[PDB]
Amino acid sequence: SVKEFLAKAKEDFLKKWESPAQNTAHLDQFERIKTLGTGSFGRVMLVKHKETGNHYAMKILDKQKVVKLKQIEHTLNEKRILQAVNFPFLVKLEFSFKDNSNLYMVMEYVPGGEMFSHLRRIGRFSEPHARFYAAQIVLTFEYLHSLDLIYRDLKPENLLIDQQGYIQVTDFGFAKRVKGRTWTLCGTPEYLAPEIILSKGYNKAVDWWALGVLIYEMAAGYPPFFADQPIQIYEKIVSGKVRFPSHFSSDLKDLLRNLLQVDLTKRFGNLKNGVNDIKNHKWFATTDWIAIYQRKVEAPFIPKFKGPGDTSNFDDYEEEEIRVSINEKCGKEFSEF
Amino acid sequence: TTYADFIASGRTGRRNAI
Numbered sequence: 104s105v106k107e108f109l110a111k112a113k114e115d116f117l118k119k120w121e122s123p124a125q126n127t128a129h130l131d132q133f134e135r136i137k138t139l140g141t142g143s144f145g146r147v148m149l150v151k152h153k154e155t156g157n158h159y160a161m162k163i164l165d166k167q168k169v170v171k172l173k174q175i176e177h178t179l180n181e182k183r184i185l186q187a188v189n190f191p192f193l194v195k196l197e198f199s200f201k202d203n204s205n206l207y208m209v210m211e212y213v214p215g216g217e218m219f220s221h222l223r224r225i226g227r228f229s230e231p232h233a234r235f236y237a238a239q240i241v242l243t244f245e246y247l248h249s250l251d252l253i254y255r256d257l258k259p260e261n262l263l264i265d266q267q268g269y270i271q272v273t274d275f276g277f278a279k280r281v282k283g284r285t286w287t288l289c290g291t292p293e294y295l296a297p298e299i300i301l302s303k304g305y306n307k308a309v310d311w312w313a314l315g316v317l318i319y320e321m322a323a324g325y326p327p328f329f330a331d332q333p334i335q336i337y338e339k340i341v342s343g344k345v346r347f348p349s350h351f352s353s354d355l356k357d358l359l360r361n362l363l364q365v366d367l368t369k370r371f372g373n374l375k376n377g378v379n380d381i382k383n384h385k386w387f388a389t390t391d392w393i394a395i396y397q398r399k400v401e402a403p404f405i406p407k408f409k410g411p412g413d414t415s416n417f418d419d420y421e422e423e424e425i426r427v428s429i430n431e432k433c434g435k436e437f438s439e440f
Numbered sequence: 441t442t443y444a445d446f447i448a449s450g451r452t453g454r455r456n457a458i
């Protein structure tokens with residue numbers, strides 16, 4: 104049963120949430136290969152675990168930049184949550200640790216590359232292709248929300264394709280365990296729900312709105328609200344008018360009018376029937392959820408894998424020396440990491 | 441076309457969080 108699985112899932116999560124794993128590896132157990140991606144206060148690198156020969160992806164966050172951009176609390180959220188969760192489509196945290204300069208999170212290496220890269224290159228995905236990914240995001244948000252977690256940073260930039268062509272969700276930087284409502288103005292301009300922009304309080308429904316932006320971008324090739332300047336993007340999100348490409352199917356557009364819904368009383372995911380309003384939507388009719396969860400379904404796209412440690416699915420980034428200061432920076436701020 | 445407007449816009453690269 105789903106309730107049964109989730110109840111067992113919750114009991115597993117809670118024991119880890121209350122008793123977080125900490126300091127389970129050290130920088131020197133890993134050989135650094137290549138920068139796979141960057142962010143405002145850090146970067147992610149392909150690494151190899153010396154003792155087993157396994158490959159992993161290591162996220163390195165600069166503590167001082169986290170503080171300058173006031174992201175201390177957000178970062179503690181990310182690790183605490185990530186180590187407690189366990190789902191087929193979540194990038195697994197294999198180990199975490201910190202040093203004088205940085206925080207470290209060592210995740211499974213997902214060799215297929217970012218959805219973003221494939222999306223911009225190909226232009227757009229077919230609907231059955233976009234659906235296969237969307238279904239996985241749907242199950243993942245069901246899992247996540249059942250734990251009282253809000254995700255808040257969905258975008259193609261934050262989704263990876265695995266070796267059998269299934270999706271893996273990454274970046275828990277804005278994720279938060281919250282039962283009530285919250286106020287932080289955060290996320291990516293194109294993906295912000297209107298309630299975030301207008302400084303109202305908000306909840307898990309912002310994730311379902313973001314899913315709507317994602318599905319639209321995957322199927323259209325561009326986002327529903329864009330302009331040269333964020334101020335102008337907000338003016339567009341807030342006005343709420345949305346236009347769809349002519350090739351979007353009816354089921355798709357309907358699904359999106361409901362996810363991209365400014366009225367919180369009407370947004371899909373946020374109603375009485377919860378996520379089932381989405382799983383049972385016509386656009387997903389051909390989707391077998393159990394088979395999807397069991398990974399028994401054939402993926403629409405199997406990435407080219409030219410061997411272990413291959414990185415040809417990621418862009419090249421300027422390599423910077425990973426410098427670790429001789430002084431502890433911001434020790435008190437990150438004590439529990 | 442909207443695709444042409446997007447592609448010619450300054451926001452087709454990776455977008456940063458605010």
Ligand SMILES: Cc1cc(O)cc(O)c1/C=N/NC(=O)[C@@H](N)c1ccccc1
Binds near residue numbers: 139145160162163275
């Ligand atoms: C490329 C890759 C492979 C993988 O197997 C797992 C990952 O997690 C990644 C990359 N993730 N990249 C981010 O999360 C990025 N948003 C970022 C946020 C803060 C600082 C720096 C970057």
